[PDB]
Design a binder for this molecule. Sequence first.
Ligand code: COA
Ligand code: COA
Lengths: 330, 330
Amino acid sequence: GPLGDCLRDWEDLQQDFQNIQETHRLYRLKLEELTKLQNNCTSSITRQKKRLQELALALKKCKPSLPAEAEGAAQELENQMKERQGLFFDMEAYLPKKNGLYLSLVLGNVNVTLLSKQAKFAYKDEYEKFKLYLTIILILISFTCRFLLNSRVTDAAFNFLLVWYYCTLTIRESILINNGSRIKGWWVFHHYVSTFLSGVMLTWPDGLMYQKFRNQFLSFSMYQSFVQFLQYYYQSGCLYRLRALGERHTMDLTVEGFQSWMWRGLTFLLPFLFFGHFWQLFNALTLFNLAQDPQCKEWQVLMCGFPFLLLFLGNFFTTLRVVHHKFHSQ
Amino acid sequence: GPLGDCLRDWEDLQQDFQNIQETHRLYRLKLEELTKLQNNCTSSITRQKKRLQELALALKKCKPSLPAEAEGAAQELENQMKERQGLFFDMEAYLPKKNGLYLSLVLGNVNVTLLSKQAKFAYKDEYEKFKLYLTIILILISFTCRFLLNSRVTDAAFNFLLVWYYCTLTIRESILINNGSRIKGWWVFHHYVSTFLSGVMLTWPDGLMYQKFRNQFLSFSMYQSFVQFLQYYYQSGCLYRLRALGERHTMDLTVEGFQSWMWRGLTFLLPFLFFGHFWQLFNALTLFNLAQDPQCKEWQVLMCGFPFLLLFLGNFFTTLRVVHHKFHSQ
Ligand SMILES: CC(C)(COP(=O)(O)OP(=O)(O)OC[C@H]1O[C@@H](n2cnc3c(N)ncnc32)[C@H](O)[C@@H]1OP(=O)(O)O)[C@@H](O)C(=O)NCCC(=O)NCCS
Ligand SMILES: CC(C)(COP(=O)(O)OP(=O)(O)OC[C@H]1O[C@@H](n2cnc3c(N)ncnc32)[C@H](O)[C@@H]1OP(=O)(O)O)[C@@H](O)C(=O)NCCC(=O)NCCS
């Protein structure tokens, strides 16, 4: 007769029930005032930012009319308002923030994980591991689809995987932007163009003109995944190094050693990126030249030759901008 | 010389700066203990649920050995443990919850909007309006692609829109599940199958056998969007009615009038759904019959004929289940 155990467990879980429901009640109260605090802080910050920017506008428009001797105080005045802006960014980094017009077309609730600092730093790492693992899958299946097979089922499967990976990746990093980062919005239009390119390659009716481009496209995709493979290593190394510099617990790792390490890494890495840039430019060129041949007539060739050229222009300019800015930073 | 205004605005915004940073500090503190409370509550609830289910298991296995006269107390004992489970569901409805293995493959942070009740009820409405608006776009462009055009560019564009809409929609409702709902997981595998179907239709190389199926597929897509058009009306009406019943402020709207209205609406709606079910079954049949013709040889025909049949079986069974359960509920 084990019922006795069950019944006295019933009432002891019952006493637990009330002592836990009291906690639940006070929790609800706490949540209420915390919400009020959040609303108050956000409204106040918005008002202050507006006031600051407008007064800075007024001072800037009045500045040329004024001589430099009294303008001394003025230049350190903007030199301090900019850091006031920086601290405003710091403070806004926690308060829940509105969605940025692309998430709001897929979602509509609020996801600002960075209510802590560990809770954010341990999201970017997960993102990096996602990029690496998917690159493994793509390089493997690209090898299979280029050296040993010639069908169109497998080719369509590879292109579908590509067009899914790019879209989930643009969602992750469009969250990672409003949490906080400097992600240089070209790096997202890059995904949109690459998605359009794969999509067009998906409805290419074969014949005697597909087989002339399949080889180059597959090989280039292989190489690009390899570059992502190396870039993982450098990026993750940089992230851990920078945390270990910000966290002084391990040892007083000076900024000098970090900078030397990062500079050596980047300067070693850069030739491969430039090789890839020129590889796709040559790719676009051969595609146009092929299109000029009067033997083909398919609208897919020019529409698959423009994204390559656009994509090269953007990538080349942005890489040079980053290296040049880093060089002046020194 | 407007500098004076600017400088005294500087120091008055400065006094504002400290009086706001104090608020920020206390806000951070509050957030800290609120996090501790959340963790404590979730751990406690997990332990209690495990204990309750295991003791219920023990009682159930011991029950057949025991006679009914003493089992009286036993049946109201399970009749009360089930409501204890219900209240546990209520309480867990607020605490942040882990992601369900599909979001965690696209995301990895936590989005439980239902920290309130308005903040959730005003998400489902947005979801409904999204479904309606996208149905408008699809019905319009389907009309254009069937009566007046015959190309393949426009057809591919329509199929791409379909395969994007289904995927964003499965993301929205897979959030809406873990917030809280009874969404009958067949209704999501439905989206996966429909996505696979459109994908296969996307790489169909035309010829003398595509033109025999294009008409039926487009017309069926039109009709299906029309059913979504009506289902919006009924669903939104039901949601507002149920809120107006739960909210007794307007008037003591009895459950009887609500039930009569909902029953009339559903009984009026059902014939169209059944028509659609049989429409797609006939569609799968004609597709197989066409495949039997020795004049075609394309692997796309059987792979486009199975999802139709599978999809019909699932839809028919699930609709009958819902109507039967609702009938016993009365
Ligand atoms: C830019 C590059 C030198 C990296 O340098 P970097 O670490 O970004 O240097 P910065 O200090 O400017 O970093 C700026 C921000 O860009 C972010 N970033 C996000 N996505 C990125 C991406 N795809 N590439 C580069 N930077 C990226 C970094 O995270 C960093 O922000 P955070 O560190 O604060 O989170 C290198 O990644 C690059 O050139 N990108 C190549 C892109 C590519 O795939 N090309 C392939 C051609 S075949
Ligand atoms: C099922 C149906 C009668 C709706 O009834 P219902 O309101 O779901 O009745 P229930 O009380 O069982 O509702 C159960 C839950 O299912 C949810 N639900 C979510 N997505 C749904 C969907 N696509 N269809 C039906 N119910 C859905 C409802 O929101 C409800 O949960 P909630 O009200 O607590 O949020 C009706 O929508 C249906 O038969 N679906 C047809 C699906 C379809 O598109 N078929 C096309 C064939 S051509």
